Nucleic acid binder design. Structure first.
Lengths: 100, 100
DNA sequence: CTCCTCACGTCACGTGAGGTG
DNA sequence: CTCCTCACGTCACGTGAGGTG
């Protein structure tokens, strides 16, 4: 089980992000301490990677919730990255013609 | 000279975006009609492409203003796209190992 | 030092509210 | 039908405000 600081450090997100996702009901710690400090599990870490993945490809957090709550995500994750790589490649292609 | 509708259609941005960038002082029409309707020039269209470019690579609009107001942007624009293509390629690489 | 909960601020707009030729 | 200016709403948080072991 991991603290907000730990997970902030592992995922590379601010603690506030980890509070927000909790308040939203997108990512909710398994339990909290006798004091009330959050405890994230490995399940929660796996989950956070997925969240952060879809986030980086611009999915709004309502949709990210939906996507994640409907086993081969990997298929669509590959397709999205390929779409996006190709898009930038076309942009970068446009840059190279400008440089000529 | 072009209306907000026209430019909205050319750039593929909402009219509200074109109002916001005006209010911010990021993109300000050359003049307005006897009625007060905005008039964007070709200079303004060129400019909007740059804005929208840096926007897509996640630059906040204050920084986008700064970048654009300091002739070979193309150098840095290529470097950014290459960084980003490589990043996704690494992500997509991680996907392919997951699929094994 | 990191943990907390309120709670108001922010950035990039969205979305009507009511009025113009 | 698109143009307008206020002006309040929104999403994804940021950033103190004051209190805990």
């Amino acid at each position: 089980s991991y603290s907000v600081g730990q997970v902030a450090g592992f995922a590379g997100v601010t603690v506030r992000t980890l509070h927000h996702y909790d308040d939203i009901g997108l990512l909710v710690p398994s339990e909290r301490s006798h004091a009330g400090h959050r405890r994230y599990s490995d399940a929660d870490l796996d989950r956070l990677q997925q969240i952060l993945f879809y986030r980086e490809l611009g999915f709004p957090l309502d949709e990210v919730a939906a996507l994640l709550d409907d086993r081969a995500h990997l298929r669509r994750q590959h397709e999205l990255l390929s779409a996006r790589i190709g898009k930038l490649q076309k942009m970068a292609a446009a840059v190279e013609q400008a440089m000529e």
